[PDB]
Design an enzyme around this catalytic site. Structure first.
Site, mmCIF file in Angstrom:
data_model
loop_
_atom_site.group_PDB
_atom_site.id
_atom_site.type_symbol
_atom_site.label_atom_id
_atom_site.label_comp_id
_atom_site.label_asym_id
_atom_site.label_seq_id
_atom_site.Cartn_x
_atom_site.Cartn_y
_atom_site.Cartn_z
ATOM 1 N N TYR A 157 3.498 4.826 6.633
ATOM 2 C CA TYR A 157 2.947 5.042 5.280
ATOM 3 C C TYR A 157 1.924 6.195 5.209
ATOM 4 C CZ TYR A 157 5.032 0.376 4.618
ATOM 5 O OH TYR A 157 5.940 -0.655 4.666
ATOM 6 N N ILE A 163 -2.376 -4.104 -11.005
ATOM 7 C CA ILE A 163 -2.996 -4.722 -9.831
ATOM 8 C C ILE A 163 -3.705 -5.993 -10.236
ATOM 9 C CG2 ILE A 163 -4.931 -4.654 -8.207
ATOM 10 C CD1 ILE A 163 -4.135 -1.271 -8.139
ATOM 11 N N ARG A 164 -4.460 -5.910 -11.340
ATOM 12 C CA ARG A 164 -5.215 -7.103 -11.800
ATOM 13 C C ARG A 164 -4.285 -8.172 -12.371
ATOM 14 N N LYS A 195 2.334 -1.863 11.279
ATOM 15 C CA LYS A 195 3.690 -1.919 11.748
ATOM 16 C C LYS A 195 3.926 -0.762 12.729
ATOM 17 C CE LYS A 195 5.235 -3.579 7.183
ATOM 18 N NZ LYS A 195 4.485 -2.687 6.310
ATOM 19 N N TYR A 202 9.294 -8.142 0.752
ATOM 20 C CA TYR A 202 8.955 -6.827 0.192
ATOM 21 C C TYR A 202 9.969 -6.412 -0.851
ATOM 22 C CZ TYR A 202 12.349 -4.242 3.219
ATOM 23 O OH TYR A 202 13.504 -3.689 3.790
ATOM 24 N N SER A 203 9.592 -5.426 -1.662
ATOM 25 C CA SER A 203 10.414 -5.030 -2.832
ATOM 26 C C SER A 203 10.656 -6.230 -3.714
ATOM 27 C CB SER A 203 11.679 -4.276 -2.411
ATOM 28 O OG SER A 203 11.323 -3.023 -1.792
ATOM 29 N N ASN A 251 12.567 -6.576 8.801
ATOM 30 C CA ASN A 251 13.919 -6.152 8.647
ATOM 31 C C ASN A 251 14.912 -6.725 9.697
ATOM 32 O OD1 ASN A 251 13.683 -4.477 6.240
ATOM 33 N ND2 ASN A 251 12.297 -3.264 7.580
ATOM 34 N N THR A 291 0.855 -1.211 0.000
ATOM 35 C CA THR A 291 0.000 0.000 0.000
ATOM 36 C C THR A 291 0.888 1.258 0.000
ATOM 37 O OG1 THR A 291 -0.403 0.268 2.402
ATOM 38 C CG2 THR A 291 -1.976 -1.153 1.154
ATOM 39 N N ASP A 345 -1.037 -4.796 3.142
ATOM 40 C CA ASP A 345 0.109 -4.439 3.993
ATOM 41 C C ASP A 345 0.209 -2.926 4.143
ATOM 42 O OD1 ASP A 345 2.893 -5.513 5.271
ATOM 43 O OD2 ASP A 345 3.412 -3.767 4.063
ATOM 44 N N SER A 385 11.509 -2.764 -5.839
ATOM 45 C CA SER A 385 11.299 -1.533 -5.049
ATOM 46 C C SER A 385 10.736 -0.440 -5.976
ATOM 47 C CB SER A 385 12.607 -1.020 -4.372
ATOM 48 O OG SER A 385 13.374 -0.250 -5.297
HETATM 49 N N1 NAP Z 1 8.782 -3.584 5.938
HETATM 50 C C1 NAP Z 1 9.430 -2.600 5.318
HETATM 51 O O1 NAP Z 1 10.441 -2.028 5.760
HETATM 52 C C2 NAP Z 1 9.011 -2.386 3.909
HETATM 53 C C3 NAP Z 1 9.893 -1.790 2.992
HETATM 54 C C4 NAP Z 1 9.455 -1.712 1.643
HETATM 55 C C5 NAP Z 1 8.209 -2.137 1.244
HETATM 56 N N2 NAP Z 1 7.308 -2.652 2.199
HETATM 57 C C6 NAP Z 1 5.975 -3.092 1.844
HETATM 58 O O2 NAP Z 1 6.167 -3.913 0.673
HETATM 59 C C7 NAP Z 1 5.298 -3.364 -0.296
HETATM 60 C C8 NAP Z 1 5.870 -3.611 -1.726
HETATM 61 O O3 NAP Z 1 7.213 -3.235 -2.012
HETATM 62 P P1 NAP Z 1 7.595 -1.902 -2.784
HETATM 63 O O4 NAP Z 1 6.703 -0.728 -2.365
HETATM 64 O O5 NAP Z 1 9.060 -1.752 -2.661
HETATM 65 O O6 NAP Z 1 7.208 -2.248 -4.309
HETATM 66 P P2 NAP Z 1 7.314 -3.511 -5.215
HETATM 67 O O7 NAP Z 1 6.259 -4.459 -4.844
HETATM 68 O O8 NAP Z 1 8.727 -3.980 -5.336
HETATM 69 O O9 NAP Z 1 6.849 -2.819 -6.621
HETATM 70 C C9 NAP Z 1 7.737 -1.922 -7.200
HETATM 71 C C10 NAP Z 1 7.055 -1.257 -8.491
HETATM 72 O O10 NAP Z 1 6.654 -2.359 -9.279
HETATM 73 C C11 NAP Z 1 5.547 -1.922 -10.078
HETATM 74 N N3 NAP Z 1 4.671 -3.076 -10.506
HETATM 75 C C12 NAP Z 1 3.752 -3.729 -9.834
HETATM 76 N N4 NAP Z 1 3.235 -4.713 -10.550
HETATM 77 C C13 NAP Z 1 3.823 -4.630 -11.736
HETATM 78 C C14 NAP Z 1 3.656 -5.351 -12.929
HETATM 79 N N5 NAP Z 1 2.800 -6.389 -13.031
HETATM 80 N N6 NAP Z 1 4.456 -5.051 -13.974
HETATM 81 C C15 NAP Z 1 5.392 -3.919 -14.054
HETATM 82 N N7 NAP Z 1 5.525 -3.257 -12.780
HETATM 83 C C16 NAP Z 1 4.740 -3.609 -11.683
HETATM 84 C C17 NAP Z 1 4.832 -0.845 -9.250
HETATM 85 O O11 NAP Z 1 4.737 0.342 -10.037
HETATM 86 P P3 NAP Z 1 3.130 0.809 -10.310
HETATM 87 O O12 NAP Z 1 2.632 1.299 -8.954
HETATM 88 O O13 NAP Z 1 3.271 1.955 -11.294
HETATM 89 O O14 NAP Z 1 2.339 -0.470 -10.824
HETATM 90 C C18 NAP Z 1 5.781 -0.580 -8.066
HETATM 91 O O15 NAP Z 1 6.042 0.780 -7.768
HETATM 92 C C19 NAP Z 1 5.301 -1.899 0.066
HETATM 93 O O16 NAP Z 1 4.234 -1.221 -0.655
HETATM 94 C C20 NAP Z 1 4.987 -1.943 1.537
HETATM 95 O O17 NAP Z 1 3.655 -2.417 1.756
HETATM 96 C C21 NAP Z 1 7.740 -2.813 3.488
HETATM 97 C C1 0T0 Z 2 7.573 1.187 2.274
HETATM 98 N N1 0T0 Z 2 8.716 1.926 2.901
HETATM 99 C C2 0T0 Z 2 9.018 1.451 4.131
HETATM 100 O O1 0T0 Z 2 8.339 0.546 4.711
HETATM 101 C C3 0T0 Z 2 10.219 2.143 4.777
HETATM 102 C C4 0T0 Z 2 10.592 3.472 4.463
HETATM 103 C C5 0T0 Z 2 11.707 4.092 5.048
HETATM 104 C C6 0T0 Z 2 12.501 3.428 5.978
HETATM 105 C C7 0T0 Z 2 12.113 2.130 6.303
HETATM 106 S S1 0T0 Z 2 13.097 1.201 7.408
HETATM 107 O O2 0T0 Z 2 12.298 0.133 8.054
HETATM 108 O O3 0T0 Z 2 13.682 2.090 8.448
HETATM 109 N N2 0T0 Z 2 14.258 0.566 6.183
HETATM 110 C C8 0T0 Z 2 14.272 -0.878 5.898
HETATM 111 C C9 0T0 Z 2 15.599 -1.668 5.935
HETATM 112 C C10 0T0 Z 2 16.752 -0.834 5.605
HETATM 113 C C11 0T0 Z 2 17.879 -1.495 5.216
HETATM 114 C C12 0T0 Z 2 18.988 -0.700 4.886
HETATM 115 C C13 0T0 Z 2 19.001 0.698 4.970
HETATM 116 C C14 0T0 Z 2 17.850 1.367 5.390
HETATM 117 C C15 0T0 Z 2 16.734 0.560 5.709
HETATM 118 C C16 0T0 Z 2 15.511 1.325 6.190
HETATM 119 C C17 0T0 Z 2 11.018 1.469 5.708
#
Ligand code: NAP
Ligand code: 0T0
Length: 306
Positions: A51, A260-261, A80, A199-200, A150, A19, A46, A204
């Site tokens: 966020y 998304i779809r 979170k 994630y990512s 993390n 999200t 998520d 990313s």
């Molecule tokens: N726990 C943490 O520290 C942490 C850190 C990072 C992320 N997260 C969570 O993990 C979620 C996902 O990771 P993320 O935000 O790094 O993004 P991601 O899922 O790696 O997606 C990266 C980009 O991929 C594109 N995408 C999606 N589906 C696609 C498709 N079928 N084909 C071509 N491109 C596509 C999207 O662009 P469009 O939007 O233009 O489709 C998106 O910006 C985050 O939104 C958050 O909920 C958590």
């Molecule tokens: C979707 N973006 C996030 O969940 C996010 C954004 C900013 C910072 C963080 S975090 O949890 O402090 N992050 C995640 C792990 C990480 C690893 C190396 C260097 C920096 C960081 C920082 C998460």
């Protein structure tokens, strides 16, 4: 569809909707795209305090409940604990604030967002005390399940070997994709009955605050493209399917109705052993989050990568 049973008995859908959008995207988009994700078939959503979207996301969920599409218990909503609230007395109120924002009675999952404690500029906090406060949130029913994000292997073992541990983390949500596949950590997690949430997983959103734009773009990888042509899918779908086949629960952020779809098609096909081996060969220790703001943190997760 499908789910995995967590080590506390609750169930988590294996595909989740990411999200997070940067601040240049208006907050109303989170409402619209979360409804679309639910309509598409996503049942795991998520979010996080960080966020600044929890009111939109909860409203998207409440609105799909209200119109008959799903019931609360069909949705897995995660939030979170942000790193300025690691002090144990701040944990439950942080969670209560998240639930008020979302206008929900409980989260399915609450995570420690990061082990890198920040002052309520770095902080020193015993994360085992943070965890105790997380366990009381579960005992209270604020969170059905509790987990971390993390964490490296060492940080996880600290929790796991805690005296008087009542609840194991159900998961560890970490950066994970074909260029940073986390194999050993994934084996460790599986050995402990802990789910690894990627994630990512699509490479990313390459935000300038955190990510070097010189870094390779995962979704332009030649092996992913060659596999996408072979299966007549897309590089994104190859990357997501890879995770499901290794036992990882995978997130996917898109704020695009088409993508998304498309992402729910991950359940419609399968990769072969040789395909899985080719993707495995892409691993190259590339974490996209790579910033001075955290590289020197006492609890930086990636300094045990060696
Ligand atoms: N726990 C943490 O520290 C942490 C850190 C990072 C992320 N997260 C969570 O993990 C979620 C996902 O990771 P993320 O935000 O790094 O993004 P991601 O899922 O790696 O997606 C990266 C980009 O991929 C594109 N995408 C999606 N589906 C696609 C498709 N079928 N084909 C071509 N491109 C596509 C999207 O662009 P469009 O939007 O233009 O489709 C998106 O910006 C985050 O939104 C958050 O909920 C958590
Ligand atoms: C979707 N973006 C996030 O969940 C996010 C954004 C900013 C910072 C963080 S975090 O949890 O402090 N992050 C995640 C792990 C990480 C690893 C190396 C260097 C920096 C960081 C920082 C998460």
């Amino acid at each position: 569809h499908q789910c995995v049973k967590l080590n506390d008995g609750h169930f988590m859908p294996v595909l989740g909707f990411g999200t997070y959008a940067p601040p240049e995207v208006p907050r109303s988009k989170a409402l619209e795209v979360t409804k679309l994700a639910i309509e598409a078939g996503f049942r795991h959503i998520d979010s996080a305090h960080l966020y600044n979207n929890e009111e939109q996301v909860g409203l998207a969920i409440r609105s799909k409940i209200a119109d008959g599409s799903v019931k609360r218990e069909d949705i897995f909503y995660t939030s979170k604990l942000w790193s300025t609230f690691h002090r144990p007395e701040l944990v439950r109120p942080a969670l209560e604030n998240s639930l008020k924002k979302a206008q929900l009675d409980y989260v399915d999952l609450y995570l420690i967002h990061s082990p890198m404690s920040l002052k309520p500029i770095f902080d020193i906090v015993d994360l085992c005390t943070t965890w105790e406060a997380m366990e009381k949130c579960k005992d209270a029913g604020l969170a059905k399940s509790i987990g971390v994000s993390n964490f490296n292997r060492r940080q996880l073992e600290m929790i796991l070997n805690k005296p008087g541990l009542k609840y194991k983390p159900v998961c560890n949500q970490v950066e994970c994709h074909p260029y940073f596949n986390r194999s050993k950590l994934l084996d460790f997690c599986k050995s402990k009955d802990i789910v690894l949430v990627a994630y990512s997983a699509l490479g990313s959103q390459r935000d300038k605050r955190w990510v070097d734009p010189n870094s390779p773009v995962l979704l332009e990888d030649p092996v992913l493209c060659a596999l996408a042509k072979k299966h007549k899918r897309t590089p994104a779908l190859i990357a997501l399917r890879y995770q499901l086949q290794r036992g990882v629960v995978v997130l996917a952020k898109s704020y695009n109705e088409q993508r998304i779809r498309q992402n729910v098609q991950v359940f419609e096909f399968q990769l072969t052993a040789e395909d899985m081996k080719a993707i495995d060969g892409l691993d190259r220790n590339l974490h996209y989050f790579n910033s001075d703001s955290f590289a020197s943190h006492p609890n930086y997760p990636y300094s045990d990568e060696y």
